[PDB]
C-alpha cells in the first residue's frame, strides 16, 4: 500500500542534535573571528613602555625588573639616610 509521508519531511533535525548548539555558537564566533588576538599588553609609555616590554611581557619573566624595582626604593631611603645623618 501507499507509502507514508515522513521521509520527505525534515524540520527538526536542526534542534535534534547537539552540534546545532555548537553550530550557532561557532557561526558567530567564527565568521567574526580575527586571525590573531589584539595584545599581550603594551601600554606604560613614557620611556617605560620599553621597561614593560623588556621585562613584563610574555617574552620573559626574569629577575631584572625585580632588581630594578628594588633599587628604586633603595635609592629613596639611601639618599634620605644622608638626609637623616
Amino acid at each position: 500500500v501507499s507509502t507514508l509521508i515522513p521521509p520527505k519531511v525534515v524540520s527538526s533535525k536542526n534542534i535534534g542534535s547537539a552540534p546545532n548548539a555548537k553550530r550557532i555558537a561557532n557561526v558567530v564566533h567564527f565568521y567574526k573571528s580575527l586571525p590573531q588576538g589584539p595584545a599581550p599588553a603594551i601600554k606604560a609609555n613614557t620611556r617605560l613602555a620599553r621597561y614593560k616590554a623588556k621585562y613584563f611581557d610574555g617574552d620573559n619573566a626574569s629577575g631584572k625588573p625585580l632588581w630594578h624595582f628594588a633599587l628604586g626604593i633603595i635609592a629613596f631611603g639611601y639618599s634620605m639616610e644622608y638626609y637623616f645623618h
Binding site: 552540534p19 619573566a61 626574569s62 629577575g63
Partner: protein, 52 residues
Amino acid sequence: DESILLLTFLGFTGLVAKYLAPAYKDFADARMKKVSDVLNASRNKHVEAVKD
C-alpha cells in the same frame, strides 16, 4: 653598619637570580604550555563538530 645589610641584600638577589629565576621561568612556561594545549584542543573540537 647598614652597608653590610645592603651587601646581604645584594647577595640575596644574587642567589634568587641564580636558582629561583630560571626555576620560576620553567614553572611558568610549563603552565603556559598546558593552558595553550587545552585552548588549541578546544579549537580542534569545534572543527570536529561542524564535520559531524
